């Protein structure tokens, strides 16, 4: 019943802007579930492309203007009906405005134009939720969607690290990415990094991860060493390093994904050559997944999923995300029988699971 803005009181901690950082929040005293929700919104790699996003997108670069109150929708609802998993959980909604899929660890030097924090926020956000209940808590769910979900692959571990670290070794922290898993393939067809929506993914990483000056988990760092931190932004790589619980939600043809690659589909003919490649993108993607044994990946183009008010509808094999993220939760007490977690669609085209979204 609508989760309440609080700006963190450690006002360091700022949006792109300088502007304070927050979070929303709507406890459920009665519950020791706690979901941290990143939200998503692309990101800026460059002084150019950020001052536009500053003209346009203000809200994902400053907090001036945040409504005082947020309603939870899809897994951060209260109500049954709409959120069949975790109604009763203590919500958090923590709005991006860092523009560095949370990977921003510095302070903003008087050389750069804007702060990129995003990290920082987040473990901003849980010390200051410590005295808010959190303390209590028997499990820390960090979730997003795109961006956000991207942010959890690289900030799931540091939370864990940061509650060990604190005195909180009993907190379980999980994390659920939803539509932040990229493939850093190459374009159907070619164009200049110009901008965010159409420069290619690895380049896109390449120039942000420098711009941001981003951080990535530190087993993953290791392995692609100095200068080559990007690797670390795509879920594929990154994720055989986590140690956390992560659960990974995907469309097979995510919208982000086909956009980045310079795909668009305006229900015009698709002659062989891009039928060709959309077939090996959802087959790459169906590869990267079978070894992440919780995982909700429908063979649907869409754009992100878990905070949209229908998430219930979607199915892959005959089970619901809410129900394999049950299932999860169960196997955390192998695999549990009528209680399924590993869902990834072999059909290879749009749609062709009838329970795609419409919209
Ligand atoms: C406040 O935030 C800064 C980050 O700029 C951090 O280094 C510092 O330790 C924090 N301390 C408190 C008490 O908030
Ligand atoms: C990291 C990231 C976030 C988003 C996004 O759409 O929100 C995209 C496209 N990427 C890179 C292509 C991997």
Sequence with gaps: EDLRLHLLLNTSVTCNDGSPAGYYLKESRGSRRWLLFLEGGWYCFNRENCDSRYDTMRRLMSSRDWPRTRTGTGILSSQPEENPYWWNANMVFIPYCSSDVWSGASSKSEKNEYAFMGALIIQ??????????????KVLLLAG??????????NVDRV????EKLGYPAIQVRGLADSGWFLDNKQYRHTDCVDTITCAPTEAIRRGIRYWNGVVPERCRRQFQEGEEWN??????????????????????????????NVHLTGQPVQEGLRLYIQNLGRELRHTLKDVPASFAPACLSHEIIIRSHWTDVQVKGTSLPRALHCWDRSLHTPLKGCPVHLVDSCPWPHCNPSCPTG
Excluded: H, I, M, N
């Design 160 to 163: 864990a690290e940061q509650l």
């Design 124 to 137: 901003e956000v849980v010390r200051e939720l410590l005295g808010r209940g959190l303390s209590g808590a």
């Design 145 to 154: 969607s795109s961006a956000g979900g991207t942010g959890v692959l690289l």
């Design 232 to 261: 670390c932004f795509f879920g594929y790589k990154v994720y055989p390093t986590l140690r956390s619980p992560v659960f990974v939600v995907q469309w097979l043809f995510d919208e982000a994904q086909l956009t980045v690659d």
